[PDB]
Amino acid sequence: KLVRLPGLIDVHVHLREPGGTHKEDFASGTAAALAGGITMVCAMPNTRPPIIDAPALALAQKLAEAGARCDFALFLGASSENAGTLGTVAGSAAGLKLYLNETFSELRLDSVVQWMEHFETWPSHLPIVAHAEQQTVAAVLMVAQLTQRSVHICHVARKEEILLIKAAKARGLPVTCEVAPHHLFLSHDDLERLGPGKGEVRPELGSRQDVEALWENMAVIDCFASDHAPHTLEEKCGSRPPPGFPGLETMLPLLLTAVSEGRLSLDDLLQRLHHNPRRIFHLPPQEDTYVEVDLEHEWTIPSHMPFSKAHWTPFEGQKVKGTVRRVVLRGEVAYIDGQVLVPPGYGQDVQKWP
Amino acid sequence: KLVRLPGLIDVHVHLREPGGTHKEDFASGTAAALAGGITMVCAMPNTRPPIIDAPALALAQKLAEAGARCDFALFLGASSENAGTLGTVAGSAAGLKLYLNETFSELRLDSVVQWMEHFETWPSHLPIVAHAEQQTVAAVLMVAQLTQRSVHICHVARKEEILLIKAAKARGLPVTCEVAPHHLFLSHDDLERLGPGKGEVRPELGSRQDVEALWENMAVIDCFASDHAPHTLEEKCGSRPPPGFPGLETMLPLLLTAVSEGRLSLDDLLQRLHHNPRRIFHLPPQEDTYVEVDLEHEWTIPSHMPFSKAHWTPFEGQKVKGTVRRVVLRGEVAYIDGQVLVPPGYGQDVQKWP
Numbered sequence A, B: 001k002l003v004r005l006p007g008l009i010d011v012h013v014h015l016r017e018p019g020g021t022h023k024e025d026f027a028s029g030t031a032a033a034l035a036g037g038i039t040m041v042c043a044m045p046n047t048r049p050p051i052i053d054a055p056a057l058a059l060a061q062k063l064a065e066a067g068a069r070c071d072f073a074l075f076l077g078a079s080s081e082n083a084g085t086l087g088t089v090a091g092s093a094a095g096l097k098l099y100l101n102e103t104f105s106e107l108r109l110d111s112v113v114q115w116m117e118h119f120e121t122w123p124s125h126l127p128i129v130a131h132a133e134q135q136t137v138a139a140v141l142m143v144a145q146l147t148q149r150s151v152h153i154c155h156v157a158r159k160e161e162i163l164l165i166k167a168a169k170a171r172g173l174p175v176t177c178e179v180a181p182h183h184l185f186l187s188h189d190d191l192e193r194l195g196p197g198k199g200e201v202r203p204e205l206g207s208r209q210d211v212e213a214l215w216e217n218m219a220v221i222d223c224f225a226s227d228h229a230p231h232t233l234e235e236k237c238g239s240r241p242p243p244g245f246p247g248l249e250t251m252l253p254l255l256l257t258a259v260s261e262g263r264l265s266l267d268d269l270l271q272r273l274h275h276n277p278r279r280i281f282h283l284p285p286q287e288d289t290y291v292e293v294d295l296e297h298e299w300t301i302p303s304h305m306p307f308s309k310a311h312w313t314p315f316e317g318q319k320v321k322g323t324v325r326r327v328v329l330r331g332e333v334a335y336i337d338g339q340v341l342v343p344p345g346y347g348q349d350v351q352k353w354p
Ligand SMILES: NC(=O)N[C@@H](CC(=O)O)C(=O)O
Pocket: A014, A046, A103, A104, A105, A131, A200, A201, A202, A203, A227, A229, A230, A242, A243, A244, A245
């Protein structure tokens, strides 16, 4: 017997188009999404060119409309030059992304004053999300309070971070957060297997105590989001490995495994991959859209999943229980048992919908 | 310039049919909902007969399908006899309502052991909501923990209650809650004007400190819900006044007034009248459904609103800013400037939808 889920939403993916299409493109990355039970993705702006102004957003919008197989929204990225320039296009984006630490991006902001300027100029009713690690979480929360608005923290990975967010929520501060599967299911213990190149990710893998703190504080986690960050094996295994893991095809199977073990409920999963993404990012429903999963199917993650061009995975060898059987998107069969059945371009920009 | 909102959801209404139809019926109560910008309502089970078994639910379902003008879900009610008997129909209901204090209902449970029995037998993935005042909030939270499941607290009205819920959320306990407009906008200060009959409501009106504590702790409030509880003026003004206020037609205008004063944002309103109702009660989207409001229109609440058969209101004389201009429900104009334009029976049981 299958179980039917609503269309799941991943609010943090890297689809690499424009400019990195050997790693992934809209067509391959959204095929990976559908195979992972994801029918809507929010794509990060750290592409080449980066999505930091109106002409780059327009280009990316057309590339996504032509290549995407599931529906999508595109983030804008904050830069050191573009505060106060995004107002006419802000509503067409998923939100504004701030890169506040070193990672795979050229968009790091060098002064908290630049963060303040973005918080003051971006429309106050639209989302701001931040790459903000360790003390940077506290710093960006301070900027949010000074400008009296909300903030969403991307890929929370550490005990320190989740406890800070917990303390802020207890004081009634408007903060939400997401956690990525690798920070729930991998730790320092896995770095020997992965090696130093494959193991490169930001935030870095945490200790067992970090992983246990995230699970213990599940009530504080508003969303799961993959931070699907594909790079080729050649890049991961080379002399200057970029940080990031592919994850669209493995996120839901890993989480279903945890559900099967009683670590969280199916409702907990649906709040974090459907309802809270909708409400934090104001994302629309998808009509006649659902995901059919088999909760009982046991399998072992192989050395690469079928669709991502990354052609590797850090979860190789993990035993999982649960699999995606069929996805229907807006009344068309989009995926069945390893075959994607909607073409590049089927997907639509959800921010253009009524 | 108007503003377009999604279809708002009221998870706590009394539509009085069957058995109290001089107070309200499905047709009049859903007309009141639409005029208040509400396109989906969850109707409480304290009718005559009360909705405490399968035959009563079947009757109510057909009466609602024939009379409702907006969409709906029907609660089941817990009784001293029906624990362990509702499993086949539980999924067809909005949830299970527990009456744990004295109020307008014959369904009070007389032993916490009966509460435990319901928490143990009702399907653990479906909603339980409770009328639970003062220490009863703590008691029902204890029962929820002992049975390791969630609970939703209806019409939170007191500083004591919101602070208890806040403490439980800080410990990661799965509790949500709602607040009704009269406990945000009326207090002991209004009892002289209302008088002792009209002023009868459960929970009773609080002190100014109770009202201020609810506002100060808005981050703890998951939903707004009217507890629309219509009774005629003759009943309210007579020798044994029943408790309750009508409220569908005044809820959104009162809350829009607060938005206009900066007391909360429009997003705060949409989380509490749309997104969190959806996610707590697993309620489906409504296609081609929206509510158009004028945020600038100033008016004074009259001695009765047009649609509720209660034909009175405790908010008479309050100045408000904001009004519902037009409602579209599933592609049909349902309401425009004081005229309902969909007939009794247009509304549907959302739990029968895919
Ligand atoms: N997380 C990573 O390690 N890499 C991400 C960037 C990011 O999310 O910081 C990427 O785009 O490769």
